[PDB]
Amino acid sequence: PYIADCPNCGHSRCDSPIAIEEVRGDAHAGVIRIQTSAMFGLKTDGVDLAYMSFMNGKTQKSIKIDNLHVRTSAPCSLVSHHGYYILAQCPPGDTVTVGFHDGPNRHTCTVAHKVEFRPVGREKYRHPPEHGVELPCNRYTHKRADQGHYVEMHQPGLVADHSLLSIHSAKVKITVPSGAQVKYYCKCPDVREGITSSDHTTTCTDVKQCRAYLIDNKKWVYNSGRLPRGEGDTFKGKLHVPFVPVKAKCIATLAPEPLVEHKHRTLILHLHPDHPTLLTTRSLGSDANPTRQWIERPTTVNFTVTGEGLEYTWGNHPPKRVWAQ
Amino acid sequence: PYIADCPNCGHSRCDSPIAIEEVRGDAHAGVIRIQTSAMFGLKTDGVDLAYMSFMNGKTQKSIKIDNLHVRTSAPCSLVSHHGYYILAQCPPGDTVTVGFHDGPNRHTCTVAHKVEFRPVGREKYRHPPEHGVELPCNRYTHKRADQGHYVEMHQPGLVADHSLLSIHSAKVKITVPSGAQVKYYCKCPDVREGITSSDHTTTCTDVKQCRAYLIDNKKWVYNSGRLPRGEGDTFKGKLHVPFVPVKAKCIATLAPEPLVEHKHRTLILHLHPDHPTLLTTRSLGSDANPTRQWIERPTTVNFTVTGEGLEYTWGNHPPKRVWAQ
Amino acid sequence: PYIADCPNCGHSRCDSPIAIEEVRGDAHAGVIRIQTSAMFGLKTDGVDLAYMSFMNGKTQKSIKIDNLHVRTSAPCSLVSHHGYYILAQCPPGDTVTVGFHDGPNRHTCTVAHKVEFRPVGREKYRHPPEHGVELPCNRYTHKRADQGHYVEMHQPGLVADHSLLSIHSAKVKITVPSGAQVKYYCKCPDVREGITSSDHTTTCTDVKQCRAYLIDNKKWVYNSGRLPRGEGDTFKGKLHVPFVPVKAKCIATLAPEPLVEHKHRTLILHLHPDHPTLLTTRSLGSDANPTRQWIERPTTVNFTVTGEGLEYTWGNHPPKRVWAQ
Amino acid sequence: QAVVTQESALTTSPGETVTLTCRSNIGAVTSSNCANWVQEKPDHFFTGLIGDTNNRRSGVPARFSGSLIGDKAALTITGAQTEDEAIYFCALWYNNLWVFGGGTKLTVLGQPKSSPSVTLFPPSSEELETNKATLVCTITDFYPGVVTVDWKVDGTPVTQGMETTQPSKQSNNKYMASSYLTLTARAWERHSSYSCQVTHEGHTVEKSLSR
Amino acid sequence: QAVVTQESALTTSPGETVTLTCRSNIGAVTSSNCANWVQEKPDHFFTGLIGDTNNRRSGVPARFSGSLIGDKAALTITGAQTEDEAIYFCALWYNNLWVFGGGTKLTVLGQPKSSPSVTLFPPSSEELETNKATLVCTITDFYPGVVTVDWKVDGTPVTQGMETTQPSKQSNNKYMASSYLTLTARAWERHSSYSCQVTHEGHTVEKSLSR
Amino acid sequence: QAVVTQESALTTSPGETVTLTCRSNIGAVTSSNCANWVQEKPDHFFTGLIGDTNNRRSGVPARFSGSLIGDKAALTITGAQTEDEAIYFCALWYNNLWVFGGGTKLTVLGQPKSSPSVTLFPPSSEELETNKATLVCTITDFYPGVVTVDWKVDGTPVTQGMETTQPSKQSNNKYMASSYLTLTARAWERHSSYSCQVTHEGHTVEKSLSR
Amino acid sequence: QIQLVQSGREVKNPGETVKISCKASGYTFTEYPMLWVKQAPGKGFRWMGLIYTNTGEPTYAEEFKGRFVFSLEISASTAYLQINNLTNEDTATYFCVRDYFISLDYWGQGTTLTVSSAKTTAPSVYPLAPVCGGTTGSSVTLGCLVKGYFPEPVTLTWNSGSLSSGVHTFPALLQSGLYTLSSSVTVTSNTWPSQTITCNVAHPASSTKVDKKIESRR
Amino acid sequence: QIQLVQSGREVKNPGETVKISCKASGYTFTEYPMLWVKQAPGKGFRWMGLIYTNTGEPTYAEEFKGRFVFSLEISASTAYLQINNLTNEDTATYFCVRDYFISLDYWGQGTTLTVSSAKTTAPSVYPLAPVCGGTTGSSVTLGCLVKGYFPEPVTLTWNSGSLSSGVHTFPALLQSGLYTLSSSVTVTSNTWPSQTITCNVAHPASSTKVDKKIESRR
């Protein structure tokens, strides 16, 4: 579970494990795929997707997911998590605002991202309905058995941990997690690399002038922009994405039927939608003479139909056609 | 407590007991009257409106209301429940989104419905204030002692319950709730009606080709569109509605006073509202020459007042009048 | 912790201790400074800002802050509390809606107030981002060590408490909190001032025709409009405000860079913002010929640049300049 | 037409956590079965503990909680006490009637042993006026509740004439029992030494009368 | 000018739930009365339990909770313990002063009985040098806390000369008391057998000296 | 390369609240040290109580809770019980290895005293066929767990030949021990009275054999 | 608070009818109906049905539809069980019970019926005083032997019921076609024979009431 | 943590004045004022007033406005009660108490005053050793008799207070115009008379201190 710098972490820029990168309000189904720097899913070892492992300290905390909250302008709905990554059904929102509850603390993370949800169709809803026609939307999956893409996930760079740099009663005293690789020296001249167990520091004294580092590359990370490079190498760790964008047919929009009214080679149409509906036509002469107008306000319109025919498209309701001799 | 098919029940179309029908964002007071298919109120038997009976299984669960949530674009405020029906003060919202918390599960239900709250008045607020004039809004009651209308509530049709169709070690085995009427046969030829205690099935074997039905018409239901008809009869069960729309005087709107400025037979009016305010006038000559314009942006306007008089309507603030000789 | 009359206290006008006055959505940083009539902060006596003292009864209740909720159109984020006063990061909202949870009851308070958050800059965002330039916004502090202003806070007037007016088995019986000053008489003729311990009432009998008053001016209050005057005097109690508006440099806005395109003494500019951006220019001739237009929709624009130069202001992005010979 | 099944007997010690279960023969138990738990203390003393699966009757200690575990209703006693030793019955609702389980006898460690209090009374004289004599041996306050009563007329184990009741539970949760030896006015006057011997948790108590 | 009233005495058994109440003579008790509950154990030992109606002092077991029930302040002991046997006082605030209730003596079943430990001492010799002799009979660690002390000089019940203190509660919650029999140097030398007899929960203990 | 320190021994009474602490020599203990608490009952019996500072293992009574108090990990027993008398060890994680504390011996008031059950056996005959004789004195079920065993051959305190094990804790939490007196087939046949004397919480128990 | 107190136990020969009352206290009768449960000697607990104390409609368990009839003296908060044409295998104990909280919350004391053929024999009440010699302890145990009656029940009190502490009443047992019962009472040695101690016995079936004072043997 | 330890108990003849100290420990004196409560022998508990340990202003209960005066040695965390022109009906125990948590959270030990006319008599301290013969058990009980003193109080310790376990000190009682007190101590039979056991008695009113070693009678 990677940890990075959340931008407006409740107060201001903290370093949250759930630091939000790559917000994708690019689908249609009310859904956003998000990456936390935290890797929830199974535990550290082997069990139960519905548990929760973020970083506390240098360490993980692979425990229950109890009170996740993604949210935006309104509280979102989770869809599924896998890896670093969560899918959640959100409404539109100027921002994105994520957070669980460990239990002692709220411990959330928030971010800017322009979000919208147009459904696919000539109706510009704000939200998916219960009914209407199905038609080919873009949307992310529920599932994990997924390989359609993979993002590079090589090592972490080092990280700071000044909990290490204690004092040896006059000298600044570094320690190690588990024998991990601590990269160490101070502004003064003393040990210059640091690949060690718990060292002391002969020369410097102040904690604030030393290299508290953790080369702990036993587990790779996501290659966040808010990661410091592991300077050594491009280690392996090519790793999939679960939530591929797929060609789901969203349960989708439909605009109320029109009121057809006859006139001489002319369609008066008293019209009354639910939401802004893009109407358009095609006078089937080799003179096309089409028309487009989003209609949200109910409006009686007109169409000079010709002899050979016109067609009529009340939103994603199917196209009509008309003989006006 | 009826159970029907919620349309976007967290994931997708579940069958929630709180399946939302008949959303009514038709009043003014920030209020919506809703019908769940669930009948909260008293328990199964006799006590305490503030308890909570939905259907779990074929069975009720008449327990506490602890964590109801109606919500929309924002979380609503409950007003009162009675029967199948709840009143709740909501803001505007493209949708309506309802849900309690049983305790082990969220178990919510959500729906599309165009909601708005215009207050009555020439001010187009988004929300009721603390002050302003009172005037005759439309609104639903708090109370239950109500008979002003009644909706038909006859029986339920059957329902599926394949928990019944167990296996008699080689044959598919139906049982009964309490001696209820189970309507049974399979694709093969065996018992053809089913009005029985726990039967077996001589002929068919597969659970997936049999009639797991529950004619359990000891308690009527609401006549939801998401109900299957009880084919036998229009049984009795005419049943009231609590939340009648009544002629409450909402605590209501008021727009800031105008800045009256004199000119020669002309009212300059530097004007500065809180919200979009429909201003309008009536030049009291037999030439009416009225004007209408919603004003939300502060605007210095003008009015060619005549000799005999004009009147002036700063929102639902009372109408003024003016001698311009 | 003062108690006043909340306007739409869940149901309607209650008397909440957290009665909201002086909403100030006048800064830029997503923040509002609010005054509850309740004085949270330290306890009654001496400890821990993060505890919670409102009025229950005539009495305080100095306990934990556990589940505060300020909110608007969305749930806000607390920033800090001090005294009667809380700072909280909110989004825009037609209203303001505040409330904690004592534990047995929700016990909230809500109010009307027009809120917005323009960030300082020619970009009209709806929300502060993670990045962009810093520039001089107006904003309130986190802190308490604050004297930049002080509001008058003299005594409370009396308050009603008909829990006092019990019955002495035939006569209406007043009591006292702790020897506090109870101001008493009834419509009938009996004791006419009331500065006493627990009195009886010789003359009247009905609780509903007597003066249940509490002159309990051992602790001053905020001078809310929803306070009854302490008729005696302007007692002392000049008391600071914590949350002064200060000249913080908000982490602030930035609009995506323009696409500069050359023409003959003419800047075509295909342009594509994130949010509505006020663009403007100054043809540096003594003929200024400036232009202003908020741009939210991407637009290819044009500028007849002169010989001597023009300047160009893509939002709060710094001003550009151009030689068009 | 449904069979509720419960453990037969469970033994625990004061301070432990013990779980009793209630199984339905028709399928998993669910919240629509409104599992009820009832306790029977000695003397045909019934009290309701839990109802509607997990609602604790008022005035029932909190050490008692109900729930559904797997496909059955369960009662957990958290910190069982000596006072909890009784028979627990579960009841399940089935759309139109109630079905009770067989009950679980629960035994909880506690109540230090207590020796019996034995008293032997002579035939009263108004009764010797009937040409009858009945020696009553009363034994009370003993725990564990199991005793052996043996009568001995003149040194000789009587073997016919005696009747001993079954230990009955007193209120304090100790037991009692009485034994009767009926003679004739005459058998009475014949023999000379009567004795009621009570054996309890290894010690013996002999109470003798002398005519 | 207000009178707080409390139950006089309440008796419960270990493990039970017991409620003590505090009533005000002026009206219902409310949160602005800041009900306080104080406990007095033997030895003039005071501790505060609850304050401001329901705030439990720190280090007071959780079995103790306060609340307002009806129009009065209440203290509930949930799982009363033997250790809770004491006097509980409630206090109510009345705008300017505090009024204490009369206190409730609470008795909780427990502490198995304990026989007294009796010792009789002879007049010391430095004291016989004063022409005085005082036999001290000390009795400690007895429970229940009630005894009868009888002195017997030379076989004869002394009836004048003795003084017996009142049982005083020791720390372990058992009691103590001492009795004095003052003679003269001379009365001393006269009689020959002194004996202090202590009667406690039916058994007798006689401690005799021999001059 | 870190030293966890714990209180050495703590004594409490049934019903009290007691806190054990765990200090790290390198700095404050934090949640990344994942404090663990383990209990050792007699017989090399280990169970885990708390892990990751405050996660209670399943089936560990709720009277046990862990937390960080100040700069150290703490274990609180709320309502300590007699059964809680054992050794509690804390463990702290240090990025790559675990360091255990020295453990705290906790003593809880309870378990009324119990006298020993002493038995002396004679040398068996198959063993007298080896030209050897060993008198075994077994002592079980005693508490407190401290005894004195003295042997006396023919009236005379043996002083060489005996071996007495160290009191070992039985399951019920009482103790046991046995003492051996080895003679020769011959020493056996010589002397005539053997006796094993066990002294426990002031009373003495002598078990003698007669050849 | 809630007390459901039931009638006392009857004896009835086969064929007879019995009306068992259940008098309710502490609740409003009308909002809580009554469960009638049969706990048969060996067999365990069984639901006999439920009566809507509001409307008055009874539900019978199928095992009980027929000879069993529930009714209520609404007015007095009583529910009643009537078993007509008593069958010998109806000996058992019947409990009334309050249905509330999605189950049953309070149970009554029970009324035990013993269906059994037999005439009516009044009991002989005999005082049980201690042995003729000594009997010196801190306390003293007296007794009362109620011998040879039919049918059940008999009631027994000590000093009109004012002496209940330290009493052991022993369940009646059938011996040679008749019931025999006994009771002991223990008091301090100062109480008796200083103060009078009296055994009070009633046998309703024979209209027999006997007060027997325990007298010293000499 | 918080300890309020009070002065010892005084004797004073009518008319005198007394200053009772209350030394506070564990809290910051200044943020918690002091309650003075009178628990009169029979009557129960009564609030005497409260002192603002910050400003120094006292509140008196009306019953106590007059002869009673609260003050504080701020500097030493002491609060004091002074009762002037002592009336005989002021014998009782006075407790200091901390006002906190909307009530009182800690109470002191109490200082008991016995207003009573009488001269000054020093006590006679007598050793109480076991009977001349035998006395063989696992333990042994010694005693100390403090006879005939006035006024109260006396203090008594065993071995300068290092021997406190197994001690029973018996409250002083008035007999023939003088107080008499006694104490027992129980130790293992190996301790005494092997190791010295000494009774330590002080009578402040007479400046009497007596150390009496318990010696064997032979």
Side-chain angles (χ1 to χ4, degrees), chain H residues 150-161:
Chain H
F150 198 80
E152 295 228 78
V154 291
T155 56
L156 189 150
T157 61
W158 285 101
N159 282 11
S160 298

mmCIF file with all atom_site columns, all heavy atoms in Angstrom, chain H residues 150-161:
data_model
loop_
_atom_site.group_PDB
_atom_site.id
_atom_site.type_symbol
_atom_site.label_atom_id
_atom_site.label_alt_id
_atom_site.label_comp_id
_atom_site.label_asym_id
_atom_site.label_entity_id
_atom_site.label_seq_id
_atom_site.pdbx_PDB_ins_code
_atom_site.Cartn_x
_atom_site.Cartn_y
_atom_site.Cartn_z
_atom_site.occupancy
_atom_site.B_iso_or_equiv
_atom_site.pdbx_formal_charge
_atom_site.auth_seq_id
_atom_site.auth_comp_id
_atom_site.auth_asym_id
_atom_site.auth_atom_id
_atom_site.pdbx_PDB_model_num
ATOM 1  N N   . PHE H 1 150 ? -6.967  12.651 78.762 1.00 0.00 ? 150 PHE H N   1
ATOM 2  C CA  . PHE H 1 150 ? -7.875  13.720 78.389 1.00 0.00 ? 150 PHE H CA  1
ATOM 3  C C   . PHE H 1 150 ? -7.076  14.966 78.013 1.00 0.00 ? 150 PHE H C   1
ATOM 4  O O   . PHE H 1 150 ? -6.148  15.349 78.730 1.00 0.00 ? 150 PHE H O   1
ATOM 5  C CB  . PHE H 1 150 ? -8.832  14.033 79.543 1.00 0.00 ? 150 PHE H CB  1
ATOM 6  C CG  . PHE H 1 150 ? -10.054 14.800 79.122 1.00 0.00 ? 150 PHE H CG  1
ATOM 7  C CD1 . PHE H 1 150 ? -11.129 14.145 78.539 1.00 0.00 ? 150 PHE H CD1 1
ATOM 8  C CD2 . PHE H 1 150 ? -10.129 16.173 79.305 1.00 0.00 ? 150 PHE H CD2 1
ATOM 9  C CE1 . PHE H 1 150 ? -12.249 14.840 78.146 1.00 0.00 ? 150 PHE H CE1 1
ATOM 10 C CE2 . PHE H 1 150 ? -11.253 16.878 78.913 1.00 0.00 ? 150 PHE H CE2 1
ATOM 11 C CZ  . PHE H 1 150 ? -12.316 16.213 78.336 1.00 0.00 ? 150 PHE H CZ  1
ATOM 12 N N   . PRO H 1 151 ? -7.429  15.600 76.883 1.00 0.00 ? 151 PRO H N   1
ATOM 13 C CA  . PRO H 1 151 ? -8.499  15.160 75.985 1.00 0.00 ? 151 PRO H CA  1
ATOM 14 C C   . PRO H 1 151 ? -7.978  14.300 74.844 1.00 0.00 ? 151 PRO H C   1
ATOM 15 O O   . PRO H 1 151 ? -6.838  13.843 74.860 1.00 0.00 ? 151 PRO H O   1
ATOM 16 C CB  . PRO H 1 151 ? -9.003  16.481 75.413 1.00 0.00 ? 151 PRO H CB  1
ATOM 17 C CG  . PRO H 1 151 ? -7.761  17.298 75.298 1.00 0.00 ? 151 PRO H CG  1
ATOM 18 C CD  . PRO H 1 151 ? -6.915  16.930 76.501 1.00 0.00 ? 151 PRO H CD  1
ATOM 19 N N   . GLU H 1 152 ? -8.834  14.089 73.853 1.00 0.00 ? 152 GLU H N   1
ATOM 20 C CA  . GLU H 1 152 ? -8.435  13.457 72.608 1.00 0.00 ? 152 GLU H CA  1
ATOM 21 C C   . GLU H 1 152 ? -7.610  14.434 71.760 1.00 0.00 ? 152 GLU H C   1
ATOM 22 O O   . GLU H 1 152 ? -7.743  15.653 71.912 1.00 0.00 ? 152 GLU H O   1
ATOM 23 C CB  . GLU H 1 152 ? -9.681  13.015 71.842 1.00 0.00 ? 152 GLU H CB  1
ATOM 24 C CG  . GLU H 1 152 ? -10.475 11.935 72.540 1.00 0.00 ? 152 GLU H CG  1
ATOM 25 C CD  . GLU H 1 152 ? -10.830 10.815 71.604 1.00 0.00 ? 152 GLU H CD  1
ATOM 26 O OE1 . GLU H 1 152 ? -9.949  9.971  71.330 1.00 0.00 ? 152 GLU H OE1 1
ATOM 27 O OE2 . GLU H 1 152 ? -11.986 10.788 71.127 1.00 0.00 ? 152 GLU H OE2 1
ATOM 28 N N   . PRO H 1 153 ? -6.780  13.912 70.839 1.00 0.00 ? 153 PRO H N   1
ATOM 29 C CA  . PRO H 1 153 ? -6.568  12.496 70.518 1.00 0.00 ? 153 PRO H CA  1
ATOM 30 C C   . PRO H 1 153 ? -5.263  11.922 71.051 1.00 0.00 ? 153 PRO H C   1
ATOM 31 O O   . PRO H 1 153 ? -4.400  12.663 71.523 1.00 0.00 ? 153 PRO H O   1
ATOM 32 C CB  . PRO H 1 153 ? -6.491  12.523 68.993 1.00 0.00 ? 153 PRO H CB  1
ATOM 33 C CG  . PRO H 1 153 ? -5.789  13.821 68.710 1.00 0.00 ? 153 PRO H CG  1
ATOM 34 C CD  . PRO H 1 153 ? -6.210  14.789 69.798 1.00 0.00 ? 153 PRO H CD  1
ATOM 35 N N   . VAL H 1 154 ? -5.140  10.594 70.980 1.00 0.00 ? 154 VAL H N   1
ATOM 36 C CA  . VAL H 1 154 ? -3.844  9.926  71.090 1.00 0.00 ? 154 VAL H CA  1
ATOM 37 C C   . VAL H 1 154 ? -3.548  9.228  69.777 1.00 0.00 ? 154 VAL H C   1
ATOM 38 O O   . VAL H 1 154 ? -4.463  8.786  69.086 1.00 0.00 ? 154 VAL H O   1
ATOM 39 C CB  . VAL H 1 154 ? -3.784  8.877  72.224 1.00 0.00 ? 154 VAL H CB  1
ATOM 40 C CG1 . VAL H 1 154 ? -3.846  9.539  73.585 1.00 0.00 ? 154 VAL H CG1 1
ATOM 41 C CG2 . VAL H 1 154 ? -4.888  7.846  72.062 1.00 0.00 ? 154 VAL H CG2 1
ATOM 42 N N   . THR H 1 155 ? -2.272  9.137  69.425 1.00 0.00 ? 155 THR H N   1
ATOM 43 C CA  . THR H 1 155 ? -1.873  8.308  68.297 1.00 0.00 ? 155 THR H CA  1
ATOM 44 C C   . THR H 1 155 ? -1.130  7.071  68.792 1.00 0.00 ? 155 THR H C   1
ATOM 45 O O   . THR H 1 155 ? -0.392  7.135  69.782 1.00 0.00 ? 155 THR H O   1
ATOM 46 C CB  . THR H 1 155 ? -0.987  9.064  67.307 1.00 0.00 ? 155 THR H CB  1
ATOM 47 O OG1 . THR H 1 155 ? 0.158   9.578  68.000 1.00 0.00 ? 155 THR H OG1 1
ATOM 48 C CG2 . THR H 1 155 ? -1.754  10.207 66.672 1.00 0.00 ? 155 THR H CG2 1
ATOM 49 N N   . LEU H 1 156 ? -1.329  5.951  68.101 1.00 0.00 ? 156 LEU H N   1
ATOM 50 C CA  . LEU H 1 156 ? -0.675  4.701  68.464 1.00 0.00 ? 156 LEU H CA  1
ATOM 51 C C   . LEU H 1 156 ? -0.133  3.984  67.236 1.00 0.00 ? 156 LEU H C   1
ATOM 52 O O   . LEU H 1 156 ? -0.853  3.779  66.261 1.00 0.00 ? 156 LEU H O   1
ATOM 53 C CB  . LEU H 1 156 ? -1.642  3.787  69.222 1.00 0.00 ? 156 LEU H CB  1
ATOM 54 C CG  . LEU H 1 156 ? -1.087  2.510  69.862 1.00 0.00 ? 156 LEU H CG  1
ATOM 55 C CD1 . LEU H 1 156 ? -1.898  2.143  71.098 1.00 0.00 ? 156 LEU H CD1 1
ATOM 56 C CD2 . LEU H 1 156 ? -1.069  1.341  68.881 1.00 0.00 ? 156 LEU H CD2 1
ATOM 57 N N   . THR H 1 157 ? 1.140   3.601  67.292 1.00 0.00 ? 157 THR H N   1
ATOM 58 C CA  . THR H 1 157 ? 1.728   2.781  66.239 1.00 0.00 ? 157 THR H CA  1
ATOM 59 C C   . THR H 1 157 ? 2.428   1.573  66.841 1.00 0.00 ? 157 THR H C   1
ATOM 60 O O   . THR H 1 157 ? 2.608   1.485  68.058 1.00 0.00 ? 157 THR H O   1
ATOM 61 C CB  . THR H 1 157 ? 2.737   3.571  65.373 1.00 0.00 ? 157 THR H CB  1
ATOM 62 O OG1 . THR H 1 157 ? 3.815   4.038  66.189 1.00 0.00 ? 157 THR H OG1 1
ATOM 63 C CG2 . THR H 1 157 ? 2.061   4.752  64.689 1.00 0.00 ? 157 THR H CG2 1
ATOM 64 N N   . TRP H 1 158 ? 2.820   0.636  65.984 1.00 0.00 ? 158 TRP H N   1
ATOM 65 C CA  . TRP H 1 158 ? 3.580   -0.529 66.416 1.00 0.00 ? 158 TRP H CA  1
ATOM 66 C C   . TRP H 1 158 ? 4.928   -0.556 65.704 1.00 0.00 ? 158 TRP H C   1
ATOM 67 O O   . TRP H 1 158 ? 4.985   -0.525 64.472 1.00 0.00 ? 158 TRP H O   1
ATOM 68 C CB  . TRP H 1 158 ? 2.804   -1.819 66.134 1.00 0.00 ? 158 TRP H CB  1
ATOM 69 C CG  . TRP H 1 158 ? 1.668   -2.067 67.079 1.00 0.00 ? 158 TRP H CG  1
ATOM 70 C CD1 . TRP H 1 158 ? 0.341   -1.840 66.846 1.00 0.00 ? 158 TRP H CD1 1
ATOM 71 C CD2 . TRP H 1 158 ? 1.759   -2.602 68.406 1.00 0.00 ? 158 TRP H CD2 1
ATOM 72 N NE1 . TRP H 1 158 ? -0.400  -2.198 67.950 1.00 0.00 ? 158 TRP H NE1 1
ATOM 73 C CE2 . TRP H 1 158 ? 0.444   -2.668 68.920 1.00 0.00 ? 158 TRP H CE2 1
ATOM 74 C CE3 . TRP H 1 158 ? 2.819   -3.031 69.207 1.00 0.00 ? 158 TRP H CE3 1
ATOM 75 C CZ2 . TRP H 1 158 ? 0.167   -3.143 70.204 1.00 0.00 ? 158 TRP H CZ2 1
ATOM 76 C CZ3 . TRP H 1 158 ? 2.543   -3.502 70.479 1.00 0.00 ? 158 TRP H CZ3 1
ATOM 77 C CH2 . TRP H 1 158 ? 1.227   -3.552 70.965 1.00 0.00 ? 158 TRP H CH2 1
ATOM 78 N N   . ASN H 1 159 ? 6.007   -0.617 66.485 1.00 0.00 ? 159 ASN H N   1
ATOM 79 C CA  . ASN H 1 159 ? 7.369   -0.558 65.954 1.00 0.00 ? 159 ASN H CA  1
ATOM 80 C C   . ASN H 1 159 ? 7.586   0.648  65.041 1.00 0.00 ? 159 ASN H C   1
ATOM 81 O O   . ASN H 1 159 ? 8.072   0.511  63.919 1.00 0.00 ? 159 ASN H O   1
ATOM 82 C CB  . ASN H 1 159 ? 7.740   -1.859 65.232 1.00 0.00 ? 159 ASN H CB  1
ATOM 83 C CG  . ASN H 1 159 ? 8.110   -2.978 66.194 1.00 0.00 ? 159 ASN H CG  1
ATOM 84 O OD1 . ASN H 1 159 ? 7.897   -2.868 67.403 1.00 0.00 ? 159 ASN H OD1 1
ATOM 85 N ND2 . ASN H 1 159 ? 8.669   -4.057 65.660 1.00 0.00 ? 159 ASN H ND2 1
ATOM 86 N N   . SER H 1 160 ? 7.195   1.823  65.537 1.00 0.00 ? 160 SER H N   1
ATOM 87 C CA  . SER H 1 160 ? 7.339   3.084  64.814 1.00 0.00 ? 160 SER H CA  1
ATOM 88 C C   . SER H 1 160 ? 6.545   3.119  63.508 1.00 0.00 ? 160 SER H C   1
ATOM 89 O O   . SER H 1 160 ? 6.791   3.964  62.644 1.00 0.00 ? 160 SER H O   1
ATOM 90 C CB  . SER H 1 160 ? 8.816   3.408  64.564 1.00 0.00 ? 160 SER H CB  1
ATOM 91 O OG  . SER H 1 160 ? 9.511   3.568  65.790 1.00 0.00 ? 160 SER H OG  1
ATOM 92 N N   . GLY H 1 161 ? 5.590   2.204  63.369 1.00 0.00 ? 161 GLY H N   1
ATOM 93 C CA  . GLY H 1 161 ? 4.738   2.174  62.197 1.00 0.00 ? 161 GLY H CA  1
ATOM 94 C C   . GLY H 1 161 ? 5.176   1.185  61.133 1.00 0.00 ? 161 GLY H C   1
ATOM 95 O O   . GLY H 1 161 ? 4.482   1.007  60.132 1.00 0.00 ? 161 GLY H O   1
#
